[PDB]
Amino acid sequence: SFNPVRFLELPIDIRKEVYFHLDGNFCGAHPYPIDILYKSNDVELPGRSKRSKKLLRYMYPVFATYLNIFEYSPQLIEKWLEYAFWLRYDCLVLDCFKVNHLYDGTLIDALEWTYLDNELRLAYFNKASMLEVWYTFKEYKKWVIDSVAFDELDLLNVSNIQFNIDNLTPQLVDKCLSILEQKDLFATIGEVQFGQDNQLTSISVIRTIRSMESMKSLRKITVRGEKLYELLINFHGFRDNPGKTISYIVKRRINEIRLSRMNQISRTGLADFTRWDNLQKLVLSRVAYIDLNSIVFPKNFKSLTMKRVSKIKWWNIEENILKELKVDKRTFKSLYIKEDDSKFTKFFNLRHTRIKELDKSEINQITYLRCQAIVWLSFRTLNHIKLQNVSEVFNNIIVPRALFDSKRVEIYRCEKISQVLVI
C-alpha cells in the first residue's frame, strides 16, 4: 500500500514535483486518454451489480451533467462513485491544492466555478474534462487556503479561479452569475473562457460580459471559437458600439489572451489587437494558420507563445534583410550564413533543426546593427516566443542574438520545423 504520512514528511520541493507530474489525476477511476482509444484495433464496449444500483440512483443525478459524458463503460462510473465520497477529503489531494496555491496556481491548472448540488461550489477538471474535486468556497477557504496562509496576508487572497462558460448550460450560467453576484466573489475569479459550441452572440456570452465590469481581478481572458473570436475580442474595424461589446474598462485590466482552437485568426485582412492595450502574453493554442504580418501588436506586449499550430508564415524578416545588405537569396543562403553551434547552442539540443547565424568577416559591424535593427523592427519589443508543436513554416525563421540567448526563444517540438537563423 501507499503511506500518506511518509509522503507529507518529506519537503515541499519533492511534493511539488510529485504533484507536477500528477497532472490533475487524483483518482484511479480515470478515463483512458484519447490516444490509446484511437491507436487500437478493438473498441472496448460494456457488457450486473448490487451496490452500484444504490449509487447510480442517488449519487449519479447530482453528477449527471459532468459525468453523463462517460456512459460508455459504466464500470468507470461505478468505480468513480466510491471515489466521489472520500477523494475530495483526502490529505494527498488537499496537500496538492496547498502546494499549488503556495506556488500561485502553477502546479495543477485552473480551479473552476460551477453550480452542482445546489451550492455554487468550485470544481477541478483534469485534462479529460472530468471533475475530480468539488469544494464550496467556505470549505476551500477553510482547510486549504487558511491552512497554508498562517499569518502572511499576501496569501489570503484567492484570485486564480477560472469561470469557463461552455462547461454548463446558459440557465446555469445565469444562476451561477446571480449567486456569484449575491456574494462578494467577483474578485475571487481569475479568468473567463468562452464557448459557442452575421454578428450574433449566444445568451450565455451576453450574461458573462454584462457582469464582467464588476470583476476587478480579471486577467487571462480566453475564447475558443472563431466566429466568436471575430466578434467579441478582435477589433474587426468597429470602434464605437455600446451594447454586445466587451466593455473597454475591463479590456485594460487583463494580462493575457489565450486563443484556443481555430483555423485562422486573420480571416479578414488583419487580426488586429489595437485595443486590449495592456496585455503581455498571447498564447495561440490550436489555431491552424496564423500570419505574423497580420497581427498589429500593442505598445507594450512581451510574450507571444504559440503551440499546436499547423502552419506559420513568419514576420517575413528575410524580405527586409535582403534589401539591407543588398544581395540575392541564393547568395545569402550560401555566403553569409555561418551555422555556429559553439557551446550555448548545444545546451538546448534541437537535434532536428539546424541553428544558423550570420558571419562576422563579411559584415563590417555596421549593417550588422542595421540587419539586427530590421529584426527588432519586425518584433517590436517582444521577448518570449516558445514554438511548441508546429509544422511547415513558410518564411524562414529569424531570431535576434539578444533574445536567442538566455532561452527567451524556445523551440520545443522539432520535427518539421528546421533552419532557424539567428540574427
Next chain:
Amino acid sequence: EDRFQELVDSLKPRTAHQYKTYYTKYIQWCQLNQIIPTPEDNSVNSVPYKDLPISAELIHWFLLDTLITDDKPGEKREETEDLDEEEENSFKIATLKKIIGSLNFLSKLCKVHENPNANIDTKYLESVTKLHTHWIDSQKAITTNETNNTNTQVLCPPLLKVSLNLWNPETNHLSEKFFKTCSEKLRFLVDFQLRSYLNLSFEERSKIRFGSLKLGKRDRDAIIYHKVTHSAEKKDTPGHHQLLALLPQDCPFICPQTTLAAYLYLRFYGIPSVSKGDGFPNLNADENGSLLQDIPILRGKSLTTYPREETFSNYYTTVFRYCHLPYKRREYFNKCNLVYPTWDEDTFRTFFNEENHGNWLEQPEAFAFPDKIPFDFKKIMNFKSPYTSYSTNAKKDPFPPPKDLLVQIFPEIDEYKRHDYEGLSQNSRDFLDLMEVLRERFLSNLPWIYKFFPNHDIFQDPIFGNSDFQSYFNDKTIHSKGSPILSFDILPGFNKIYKNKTNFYSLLIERP
C-alpha cells in the same frame, strides 16, 4: 498513423468523450441487432475499426430505433404540457445533431483504420437534419404567436384552408370561368395535395400515371408512388430509386386518398345527367407498362394527357387570392429543398435485400423502413408525429363501412374478381386492389363530406338517397349534432385550435 494527431486535436476532450458515448450507443445497437457479430460470450466484447459497418441508412436506422421512436409505454404520458414536450423534442433535435456529428466522426475514424464499409453519404443525414429541423420549427411556429402581424397564419395553415375551400360545391366568389365543375376543383385539390404531401416539382407531378401508384406491402394504408428512374431522365448510372407515400389523414378533407378516390369516381362516372366522365378503362389488354403507364392521374385537354402549366399557375393565383395567401413561384412550382431521399442502385440492392442479410436479427423493412421508405420522412411529409412510431392512430374506427355499400359502387372490380382475376397482368389487379383501398377510404370518409357539404357532385345520383347510404351517414354523423368541438383530428399541432367547430367553420368563406 499520420492522421491520428489532427484527429485527436480536432475535438475538445469533452466533445471526444461525448462522441464516444454516442457511437458506443451505436455499436451496442449494432450488436443487439446482429448487424456486427459479437466476439464472444461473457467476456470483453470488442469490435475492430476495420470491419465496423457504417452507412447512411445504418446511421439513420439507429437514429430511428433509438432516438426518434420515443414510444416508452411506461412513461409516454409525460408529454401533455407544451413547454415540457417542447423542451423534450428540442433535446431530441440537439441529440440528433450531436449523434449525427459523432457518427460522422466515427466514419472518419474508421477510414484511417482501413474500413472499406465506412462511407457516410452525408447529404442523406443533412436531409434528415433538415427534415427534423423543419418539423421542430413548425412546432416553434405554433408555440410562438407574437413573431409578426401574421398570428392568423400562425394559427391557420395553408393546406387546411385551401382544402376546405376547395371542397365547397359552390363557387359564387371563388371563380367564374376557372372552377365551374366540382370535378375540376377535385383534380386541382388532387394536384395541390400531391404537391403538399409529396414535395415534388410540377414535372414529377406530370410524370404521375395510374400504374405508378403501388400499395403497401407492409402497411396497405400507404399509396406507394415508386418513382422509377433508370438511366434516362437526366442521370446516368441507371438505378435511382425515390420512394413516395400517401397516408390517410385524420381529417377526411385533407386526405390525399379520399380526394384521389373522389376525383377518380367523378372521372370514371361523373354525373349521368350533366357531365359524363372518361369511363372505366379496359384493364384486359394491359401490357405490363402500356395502358396504366399511358393514362395520367388527372385529365386535361385530351382524355389521356396531363394539363397545362399556366392553367395551374392561374389556379394557384386565384385560389391564393380567394384564400388571402401570399403565393411565391418556387414554393409551388420548382424543386423543393427538402424532399424524399433518392437512393442509388448499389445501396438499394445491398441493404433492402432481405436474403443477403440473413445474419441480422431484424430486417430494416420489417418495422423501421416500411415499404422501403424511411419512417420519419413518411410521417413528416404526411403531416403526422413519428415519435410514438408503432401506434394505431389512424386505426381509430367507429362505425366501419359495410361491404354492401362497397359492392354497390365500382362494381367492375367485383366483375374482374368473378372474371379470371389471376390471368390478368400484374399491374391490372394491383390497380384493382388500389381502387379497392381507395374505395374503402372514400366510403369511410363519405359521411363527413355529406354532413358538411351535402351539395357536392358525388350526390348527383339518386341511388345515394337510399336507406343504407343515408343510414350509414346518420350512424357516423349522429355524434356531431351537439358537441362544441369536432370528433376527428386535423393535424399534430392544430388539434387544440381548429378542432373547435367555430374556427373550423370560420375557415370557410361561403356558408361558414
